[PDB]
Amino acid sequence: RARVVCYFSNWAVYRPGVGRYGIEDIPVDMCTHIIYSFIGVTEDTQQVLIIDPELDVDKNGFKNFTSLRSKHPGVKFTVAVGGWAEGGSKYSKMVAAKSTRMAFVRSVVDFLNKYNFDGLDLDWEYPGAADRGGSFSDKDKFLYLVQELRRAFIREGKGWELTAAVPLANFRLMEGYHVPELCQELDAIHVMSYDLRGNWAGFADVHSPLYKRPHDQWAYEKLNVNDGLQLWEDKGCPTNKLVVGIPFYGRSFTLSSGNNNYNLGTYINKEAGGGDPAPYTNATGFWAYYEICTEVDTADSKWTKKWDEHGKCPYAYKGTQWVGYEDPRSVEIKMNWIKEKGYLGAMTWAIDMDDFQGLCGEKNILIKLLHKHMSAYTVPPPR
Ligand SMILES: *[C@@H]1O[C@H](CO)[C@@H](O)[C@H](O)[C@H]1NC(C)=O
Ligand SMILES: *[C@@H]1O[C@H](CO)[C@@H](O)[C@H](O)[C@H]1NC(C)=O
């Protein structure tokens, strides 16, 4: 009764060569809930914004995705609104008044009906975040949006789910999230237990450490997956609503000039913006799992791979380049820990970055680990 929640990126179809990943590449039976990412909100009218209408509507992307249920009927297919590229300001604007929230809610209900989705995942990054166009009143008004969406979903009578992707840093929680009230209205809380470190922090480190390391101090002291999920529990979310995110990508860095120390916490060249872009994702500071394994795991690789003994995550480096990520060892350790803690299940950002071509020898290796572990696991009653 555990969940395996798979985010699917609608832009991965534009990656070149073996990076191209479309609806037809989703390994549907490895997931229990699959989430088409992203739609947005319009700035002026507070309606659903279709972000790639040529793909999502003209080439039938949304409907090909939802019509996957014909052959896979036990899986739920929902849509996510928001995401990082959307920004936060349009969402703060949309929730600022009852009238604008109701315009959005109506728009969402029409959309979910039009494309036969099973519900909505909220991915506003983030209510209350000054760095993302937010402000103080977002905390109350996001809860109002959630309560209003749930009521609309009940009125529609189709049993749609409402879920949200959430951060784990305490300051983000305090600024944006009425935890007990939200966890009561939502079917699942998809915890973004990743991007916990990265170029923005000014030092090299793995980005999904499971436990605290000695170098973790002040706002990093509890910024790890174990303590972050414990914070969600402490603030009032039931264990059986929490789904733990697992990144199928690495955060990379360019090390500072003449720096020969490759340990966790080593200084970086922050102005570089991260490690150099990889060939398929073409994004500074961000490498898909398949981009990492094809470089690090080959027999004649010149990368050096190490292990964070406390964070339980791999990292690898070569030259000035350093990347922290998840591999099968670390993902196994996290699946066992989810079961130990009794959480609702596992989530992946994102299924389009697993080694779905088997470039490294084993097709869909990471999602197969999530599926193997979760499908044999019974979620216990709340703690
Ligand atoms: C949807 O499926 C049709 C029929 O197979 C295909 O031609 C089309 O390219 C698909 N569109 C997307 C976005 O996957
Ligand atoms: C990679 O993205 C950069 C922006 O960072 C863009 O300028 C460049 O054209 C892209 N290259 C490819 C091959 O997509």
Residue numbers in the entry: 24 to 406
What do the paper's sentences say?
The glycosyl hydrolase family 18 (GH18) chitinases (EC 3.2.1.14) are enzymes that hydrolyze chitin, a β-1,4-linked N-­acetylglucosamine (GlcNAc) linear polymer, into chito­oligosaccharides. Among the eight groups of insect chitinases, group I chitinases have been enzymatically well characterized and have been shown to function in a chitin-degradation process that is closely associated with insect moulting. Our previous work reported on the group I insect chitinase OfChtI (previously called OfCht5) from Ostrinia furnacalis, a species of moth that is the most destructive insect affecting corn production. OfChtI is highly active in the hydrolysis of chitooligosaccharides, colloidal chitin and α-chitin, and exhibits kinetic properties that differ from those of bacterial and plant chitinases.
